Design a binder for these strands. Structure first.
Ligand SMILES: [Zn+2]
Ligand SMILES: [Zn+2]
Ligand SMILES: [Zn+2]
Ligand SMILES: [Zn+2]
Lengths: 73, 73
DNA sequence: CTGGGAATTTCCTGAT
DNA sequence: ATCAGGAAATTCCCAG
């Protein structure tokens, strides 16, 4: 396997239970330790990839959870 | 008793031809000045308000133009 | 070798 | 024209 399950960018390994890129790894860590205030300006279907992942942390965090990312993994 | 024509936040006056808040004023200036290629992660229909205006500069910039904001005014 | 996490840098936004 | 808070992504060091 390769290709991070969140943003489809090249994956650096298995992080918090899921194959992800380095950027999504630290994003999830930040989001989960913080209070995740995030609001989607769209329909919560936003495209998350290398280009657009910065746009919507709401949808990015959702895709992190849906992929099964968790801290104790 | 009047609001920014872009994000609906309290308007500070008439900026670049349109009633806007200070934040949308400097955003627009920076956007035109700034080479920026913006990409919406959504449908280009994004909700732009006080909180969500940070999410999508693409739709924010579009709303600036649609409202009639221009450096010539 | 693996992955967690701190540190660092850069960028965006908004106020002064 | 600064300046500061925040988010983002890389670099680096840690334990295993
Ligand atoms: Zn990713
Ligand atoms: Zn979204
Ligand atoms: Zn505004
Ligand atoms: Zn948008």
């Amino acid at each position: 396997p390769k290709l991070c399950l969140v943003c489809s960018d090249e994956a650096s390994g298995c992080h918090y239970g899921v194959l992800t890129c380095g950027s999504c790894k630290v994003f999830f860590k930040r989001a989960v330790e913080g209070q995740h205030n995030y609001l989607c300006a769209g329909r919560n279907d936003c495209i998350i990839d290398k280009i657009r992942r910065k746009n919507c942390p709401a949808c990015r965090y959702r895709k992190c959870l849906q992929a099964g990312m968790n801290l104790e993994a």
